[PDB]
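Batch 3, record 17
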Amino acid sequence: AMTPFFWMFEEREKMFEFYERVSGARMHAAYIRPGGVHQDLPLGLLDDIYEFS
Amino acid sequence: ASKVKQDMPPPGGYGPIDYKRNLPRRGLSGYSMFAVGIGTLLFGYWSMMKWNRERRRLQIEDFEARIALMP
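Prediction for the assembled complex:
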């Protein structure tokens, strides 16, 4: 079954956008660090996460 | 020295987000589909009966023409 792959990889792309907006990298962000996280969220990220969810 | 500005959820709260499975029923009963199929079959049978009898009569006519022409 090939079609669900294509349907769901667009959602994967949007979540990659969330990754990049928080860290600058689509898949190997390196955001979570032993002391916490590297940087704080940008000012409009929670809204877009809610819109996706 | 302004107020702290941080990414945060809006006053009160964000709207509820759906997560449960949603697969509507969306279909007729089995009896209705079986009845429609059987009705289609019967209508086709009766139409085919008429057409095949007409074709048999036409074949008889052509065979009679051949019989007339044979001698």
